[PDB]
């Protein structure tokens, strides 16, 4: 399994861990996420906001503080961990889902929750306007325990289509499993 830095290659460290409750996964850090080395960090980004906004976070944080998100059961990664900009963008050899399967297998997140469309079509195989928001019907192959979510862009390109329905309703989905864990 790669280690969290991907050796020294990827932009912006994996936030990956066994135990966790969901694992947030975008396309690629953006320019701006990259030079900060760290996720969504595009002040105009909807991401930090809609966590604190459904109670995946009780604060909202700061992009720089992604990696404390194991304390709420959340973690990250992207499908393209070596390159940044724009989806449209990027070189085809940037994608890799290969190593994001690899990930979810060792690490055995409760819920793997795609960030946009693209990045759960380049992993699922299926165009985006085939892919509904919110749980997937469980696919081919995945650890049965682990849920796979698709949710609205938070990107301000996307304002547009952003629906907060699919990210609370995740939200409460976390709370429920946390809730279940405690009992």
Same mark, same amino acid.
């Given at each position: 399994?790669?280690?969290? #830095?991907?050796?020294?290659?990827? &932009?912006? *460290?994996?936030? @990956?861990? =066994?135990?966790?409750?969901?694992? /947030?996964?975008?396309?690629?850090?953006?320019?701006?996420?990259?030079?900060?080395?760290?996720?969504?960090?595009?002040?105009?980004?909807?991401?930090?906001? #809609?966590?604190?906004?459904?109670? &995946?976070? *009780?604060?909202? @944080?700061? =992009?720089?503080?992604?990696?404390? /998100?194991?304390?709420?059961?959340?973690?990250?990664?992207?499908?393209?961990?070596?390159?940044?900009?724009?989806?449209?963008?990027?070189?085809?050899?940037?994608?890799?889902?290969?190593?994001?399967?690899?990930?979810?297998?060792?690490?055995?997140?409760?819920?793997?929750?795609?960030?946009?469309?693209?990045?759960?079509?380049?992993?699922?195989?299926?165009?985006?306007?085939?892919?509904?928001?919110?749980?997937?019907?469980?696919?081919?192959?995945?650890?049965?325990?682990?849920?796979?979510?698709?949710?609205?862009?938070?990107?301000?390109?996307?304002?547009?289509?952003?629906?907060?329905?699919?990210?609370?309703?995740?939200?409460?989905?976390?709370?429920?499993?946390?809730?279940?864990?405690?009992?």
């Amino acid at each position: 399994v790669p280690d969290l #830095t991907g050796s020294g290659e990827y &932009l912006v *460290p994996d936030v @990956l861990q =066994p135990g966790l409750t969901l694992v /947030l996964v975008g396309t690629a850090p953006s320019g701006i996420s990259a030079r900060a080395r760290a996720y969504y960090a595009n002040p105009e980004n909807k991401f930090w906001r #809609t966590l604190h906004a459904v109670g &995946l976070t *009780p604060r909202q @944080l700061v =992009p720089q503080e992604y990696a404390t /998100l194991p304390q709420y059961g959340l973690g990250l990664t992207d499908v393209a961990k070596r390159h940044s900009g724009v989806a449209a963008a990027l070189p085809g050899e940037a994608w890799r889902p290969d190593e994001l399967r690899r990930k979810v297998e060792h690490y055995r997140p409760r819920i793997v929750a795609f960030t946009s469309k693209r990045g759960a079509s380049e992993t699922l195989g299926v165009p985006t306007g085939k892919l509904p928001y919110g749980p997937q019907p469980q696919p081919l192959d995945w650890p049965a325990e682990t849920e796979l979510w698709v949710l609205p862009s938070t990107s301000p390109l996307g304002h547009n289509h952003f629906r907060l329905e699919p990210w609370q309703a995740l939200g409460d989905r976390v709370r429920e499993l946390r809730g279940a864990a405690e009992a």
